[PDB]
Amino acid sequence: VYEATPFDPITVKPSDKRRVAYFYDADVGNYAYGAGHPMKPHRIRMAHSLIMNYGLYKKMEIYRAKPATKQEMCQFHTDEYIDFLSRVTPDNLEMFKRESVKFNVGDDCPVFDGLYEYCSISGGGSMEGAARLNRGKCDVAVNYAGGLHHAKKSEASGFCYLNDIVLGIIELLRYHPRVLYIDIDVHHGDGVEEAFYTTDRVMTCSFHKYGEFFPGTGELRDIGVGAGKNYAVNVPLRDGIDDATYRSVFEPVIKKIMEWYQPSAVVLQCGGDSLSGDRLGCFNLSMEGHANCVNYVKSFGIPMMVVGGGGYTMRNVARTWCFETGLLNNVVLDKDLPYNEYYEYYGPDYKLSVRPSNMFNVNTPEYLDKVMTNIFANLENTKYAAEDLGDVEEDSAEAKDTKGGSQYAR
Amino acid sequence: SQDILDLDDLVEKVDFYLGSNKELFTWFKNFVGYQEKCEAFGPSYKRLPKSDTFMPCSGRDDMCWEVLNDEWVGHPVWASEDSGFIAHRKNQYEETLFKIEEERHEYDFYIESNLRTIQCLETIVNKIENMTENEKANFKLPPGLGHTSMTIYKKVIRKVYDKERGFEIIDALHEHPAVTAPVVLKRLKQKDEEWRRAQREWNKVWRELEQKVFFKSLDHLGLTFKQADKKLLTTKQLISEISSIKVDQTNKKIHWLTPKPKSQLDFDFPDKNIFYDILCLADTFITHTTAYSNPDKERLKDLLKYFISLFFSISFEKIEESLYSHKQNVPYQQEMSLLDILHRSRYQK
Amino acid sequence: ARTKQTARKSTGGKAPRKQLATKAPHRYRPGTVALREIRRYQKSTELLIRKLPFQRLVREIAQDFKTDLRFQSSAVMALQEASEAYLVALFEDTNLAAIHAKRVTIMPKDIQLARRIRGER
Amino acid sequence: LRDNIQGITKPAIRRLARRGGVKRISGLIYEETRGVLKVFLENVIRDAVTYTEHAKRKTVTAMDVVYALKRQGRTLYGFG
Amino acid sequence: PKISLQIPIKLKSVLVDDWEYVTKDKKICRLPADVTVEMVLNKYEHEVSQELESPGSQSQLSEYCAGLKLYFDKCLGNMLLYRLERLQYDELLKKSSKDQKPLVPIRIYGAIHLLRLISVLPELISSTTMDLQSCQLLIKQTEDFLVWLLMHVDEYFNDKDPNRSDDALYVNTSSQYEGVALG
Amino acid sequence: KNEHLEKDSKGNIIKLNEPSTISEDSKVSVTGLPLNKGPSEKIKENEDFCSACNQSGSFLCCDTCPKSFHFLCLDPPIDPNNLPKGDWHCNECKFKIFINNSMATLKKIESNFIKQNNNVKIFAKLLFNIDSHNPKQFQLPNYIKETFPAVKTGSRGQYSDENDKIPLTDRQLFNTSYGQSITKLDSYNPDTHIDSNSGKFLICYKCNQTRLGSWSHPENSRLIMTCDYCQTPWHLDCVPRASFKNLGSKWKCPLHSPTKVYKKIHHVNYKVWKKQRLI
Amino acid sequence: TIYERLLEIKQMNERVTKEINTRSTVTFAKDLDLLSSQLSEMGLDFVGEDAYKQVLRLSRRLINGDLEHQWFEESLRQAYNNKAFKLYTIDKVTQSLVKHAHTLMTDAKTAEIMALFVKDRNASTTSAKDQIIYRLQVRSHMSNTENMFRIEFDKRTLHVSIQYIALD
Ligand SMILES: [Ca+2]
Ligand SMILES: [Zn+2]
């Protein structure tokens, strides 16, 4: 059921005029993982710096989510794990040796200074994004600071300490009976899939590279257990997927899910790793082929939340996150960067484009038909049917932020 | 037949054997009585015991208990079969854009983290000069200096002021800011000016290096092409390739019963003007080449024009104008048959 | 008590963790062939030290004296034919020292003595 | 080029000493010879570079190594 | 010298499977098992006591059962635990002190751990200095026990998938339990 | 040729310290300019292995003898947070110390133990001896592992079977030219579609074709791998299969009999059958 | 092989030629000196000509030896978005084609094959048996081991079909 079709230019849908809410906490740029570490929270700041110069702040509503408390972080993570995060600092690593092995923290996911604060910025950012959708204040929430989908209940994996998406989804689940989670990061979203595997209230459709690629889970046969059987949907893609082939897979599958299992809300994790040129991911997706994924899910008309997730090349992910923020606001951005503080990065033509590479596309139409056939076989079973709650406090950040980002330097 | 294997599982396994012979497999499905139209656990996830699921969570509502998963767990060290993973290989040049990226971040992280302290202290410092000197005596700053982030202003002061010495600065900054904040702000601006002056000098180094090696980083196949071609364009593989198609049409004949057809390989030539383009290319190389002796090169030039004009029905005179024009860009013609060209003895006549 | 330490803090070993710390009949009696190996060498003049492993040894030494040197392919030879000879002389002197000590097998005692007596220490 | 002195093999030394005249070579030589050869080159090169570094050249040519060897007393013939 | 102990193949195939679950599959046995080393020997001592008539052998039997229990308590800590199971053993000691009752391994551990002690009995015998007539006394007596264990292998060693039954003798290990035990 | 901070809190602060800013940052010194810009510019006593495990980790070292132990291995286990104060000894050294300097002949010490417990007498020596040895990790005696030819001890003491693929040489994983990656044949290797020894083409079982495509058009090529037991080539498409699986374990091709069967009784819910191990 | 590599360039030639001309410098990158000017000075940017005709007169310089290899390649990287990587060995494939064409004049056994072909290709009226006559004579010149090919041409549809033959 895989029909190869050439890519079409991204067209904006005038039917939907969603009022977006953008969550930017100005501090989230100032945390650094290590000397050579791939995860660089700088990419949020540049992706925000570009956004303000297009004048997208005229359409969006800028918010600064109140950082997540220590208790609210525990509604997914066990109390022992969160308690370890609060105290742990580079000077304290000697005192904690049993924990640092038990909790996979500080060796690949380093214990950098400010470990707790950065995690506290991510969660209140996604959690409140769900809280605003529930109240009806915004049809979209954009929290690029968060999206860390690799963390587990008592373990930090894949650079992700606090799994905000689970915290975000649990907030949506208090109003919406069913929630759909869509993963477009090249890695398997094991952090969210393993959390919601049993329940049927969440479907975790994840696109990833299988074949002993981290975390080496997400095989096609993993479809959940117990009540949540068929309510998990993994699409194991091979190397070198590109713009035209990705659309021919993403769109048919998503269209099937939102027909058979009608979600009340979507949590779309716009992973930057899938883009071409990233240091850890191996796909050939360009921006237009990647931002089209967001435009398709938006077109359905149901409330969604966009989380940043993982992106390892600051130049590429900051460009595509700005373009995706354009599509949600019903504006297709011009292919000309505006002057911004981080201008020397986007070489060499200084245009807003992520150029697809030359690498050989290996997914074959005979293979993709067998993967998409099994999924459709399963999906025909999924017919529809100091605590703060509904944290809502938002802070109205733009008065403070307008002088940032918007540059008249010369 | 030993009642160890269920009937449905038997038919599923036989499918991998007799799948192609539809007339046979259908008979087998008819024979055993198979009728068409949980245990689907999956390979990734393993169940934990009941006791281990009791490790507490403080803020889990009743709703969270039904939704979240505690029994089933999956980890990389199990899915990897303990043998590890394979990371995607990267170019020699694509690893330069990664070295540059880190050098970019290292300068950018320290400068920007420094600015956020400058504004934090700048609003503070102006407050002191408003206050009375007696007042100045008692204006301690709570941690975070009233700012939103308690951690940022520590990692910046500790970097500048010598590691450990830096700790009693912060304590002095809280306990006695009126005389500490003006001094710390002064130096932090001074360290800002030095850091920026470096970046600009480092900006030229990074920009040109990215210019020399960017378009190579995208080019995964181009770098390895020059070596691959001479490996895969040879007298051997061009015959292995065409033979591989012949065996497929005859193999199935063994199994799928495909008839033996003609024309294993098919080519198509939609555009004529490529032929004058290839000829003028090989015309240039032949004249330039030093290996072929000058009298013989006239045959090499005259072979390609005649063979092409013969095989592809293109008139020879049309070809000669095309070469002539390409000669312009930079006395008699009897009928030279390709048959004449192929024998040296007749060629001299 | 004194406890060394653990060098690395993870159970996976980082092989499964991305950005890994650790994942990115007839026989001659003894001696009879020896002599046959000598007359097969003392009669020949071909270079004994393998060349491309020597080239990379000279470059490594040149670095800490000056950076970005470029050796003429002749001046890597002229080093090799020298350092081969230096050693062959040293080994003759050590063989003498061992024949002296009344054993046959040269040993580092013999090397160090044949250098000390030369005064080239 | 972290360790190249381990590139001068065990059969390399064994072949040399076989030319020298030995018969049985004790195991600790194969390591200890490397210690000698190394401290030989560090003297021959450090001189050859200086002749080069003087003439402003950036290439240690054979006419240098022959000179550096000459002061060592180990005069070399055949190159200049 | 070298002492030979003939373990029946079926029991010799169990152990290997136990060696696979604990080192490769990385699953450990539920420690408070249903058939512990104590009642296993309680049944065997009780089934064989009536079987044999001569009172002389009854003394030989009863002490081999009484002895094997006392030896098992001393032995389990030292050399009857794979590395991955050391932590689970530790938490039992740490639970025992809080419960204020001293841990007694024969009450806790299952029949498979008794078989581990039997497997290394020849190596333990050879290390010490014993009378030869007692060496054949233990080995013959043990070979009589293993034969009895073979007749009842079905209802001590059952192959149940831990994911499924949850009554299986082995239970999987969390990614946190495995981390500390191996790390 | 040699001959040739503290501040009066009322007062101002003495400057903390002149910043010794030699950071050796990834760029050479944060304050320093680029250096020479040559390229990049277009114009110009105790052992280290646990005596019990024989592996690495955090150790607790015996004082008398050069034997180190894990924190978990020693009996009873010792918390890394809380340790016995002062010097520590392995249970072996404690024994020798115990014996030595008191009732020194062991015999008499042991002769009391056997006489002490006459009921357990048959096990008397074995009980006494166990107090002297250090803690150990259980390893199956060789006469058990030698019964089954397939099983073999791994590098770490693991159970390694005929199923586990022999490990790839560390060079093969990380030392390859860019064009050809051994680990993944995802760069159009056409020599996969050939049988090395015989020279004929490998033919998939499902479709009875080999899809070796032209060098002109490589997208016509379909990837083929071979079973690790059967040696029957399969496309990565026919067995739906994402990749080659050359790291974890030998790939059992479909078409090979089951070695473990879970049968639902349809009335415990299930019965398990496992093939007898090869003796 | 040359025709397949060249044609796929000419098919893109209409789209690429428009794209190269219409690309514009960002004003914020032109006031400052940021955009690379290395190729513009050397002239290897397809600003003034159609892309395909320019690719030829760059290749003609490659065989002539005027243009360094790494500069010829880099010019097609920026001009064609890495799409045209196959034209990196147009100098060598041209060479191998000439070398093989040289074998046709020499190797008098092979030349005698195209001695027959020219006569057959000139024949308008060929009986069915005439082809067999043509085939059997050609088989006489090859050794009984070599495996002759059949290249078939259709004038109306410019369709060339090659059949692999290893008959008696
Ligand atoms: Ca689910
Ligand atoms: Zn990712």
UniProtKB/Swiss-Prot annotation, chain A:
EC number of the protein: 3.5.1.98
Keyword annotations: Chromatin regulator, Cytoplasm, Hydrolase, Nucleus, Phosphoprotein, Repressor, Transcription, Transcription regulation
Effect after changing V331A: Strongly reduces HDAC activity
Disruption phenotype: Heterochromatin spreading downstream of the silent mating-type locus HMR.
PTM sites of type Phosphoserine: S396
Active site feature: H150
Catalysis performed (reactions): N(6)-acetyl-L-lysyl-[histone] + H2O = L-lysyl-[histone] + acetate
Keyword Cytoplasm: yes
Motif extent (ESA1-RPD3 motif): 319-339
Predominant localisation class: cytoplasm
GO BP, one annotated term: response to oxidative stress
GO cellular component term of the entry, any: nucleus
Subcellular compartments: Cytoplasm; Nucleus
Domain of life: Eukaryota
Gene3D superfamilies linked to this entry: Histone deacetylase domain (3.40.800.20)
Any one GO molecular function term: histone deacetylase activity, hydrolytic mechanism
Consequence when changing L337A: Strongly reduces HDAC activity
Enzyme class: hydrolase
Oligomeric form and interacting partners: Component of the RPD3C(L) complex composed of at least ASH1, CTI6, DEP1, PHO23, RPD3, RXT2, RXT3, SAP30, SDS3, SIN3, UME1 and UME6. Component of the RPD3C(S) complex composed of at least EAF3, RCO1, RPD3, SIN3, and UME1. Interacts with cyclophilins CPR1, CPR6 and CPR7, with the kinase HOG1, and with ESS1, CYC8 and HAC1.
Similarity comment text for this entry: Belongs to the histone deacetylase family. HD type 1 subfamily.
Protein name according to UniProt: Histone deacetylase RPD3
Naturally occurring in which organism (per UniProt): Saccharomyces cerevisiae (strain ATCC 204508 / S288c) (Baker's yeast)
UniProtKB/Swiss-Prot annotation, chain G:
Superkingdom classification of source: Eukaryota
Compartments it resides in: Nucleus
Function of the molecule: Catalytic component of the RPD3 histone deacetylase complexes RPD3C(L) and RPD3C(S) responsible for the deacetylation of lysine residues on the N-terminal part of the core histones (H2A, H2B, H3 and H4). Histone deacetylation gives a tag for epigenetic repression and plays an important role in transcriptional regulation, cell cycle progression and developmental events. SIN3 also has a RPD3 independent function required for normal longevity.
Subunit structure comment from the entry: Component of the RPD3C(L) complex composed of at least ASH1, CTI6, DEP1, PHO23, RPD3, RXT2, RXT3, SAP30, SDS3, SIN3, UME1 and UME6. Component of the RPD3C(S) complex composed of at least EAF3, RCO1, RPD3, SIN3, and UME1. Interacts with ESS1 and STB1.
Misc. remarks from the entry: Present with 1660 molecules/cell in log phase SD medium.
Protein name per Swiss-Prot or TrEMBL: Transcriptional regulatory protein SIN3
Species this protein is from: Saccharomyces cerevisiae (strain ATCC 204508 / S288c)
Residues of the full protein shown: 1153 to 1320 of 1536
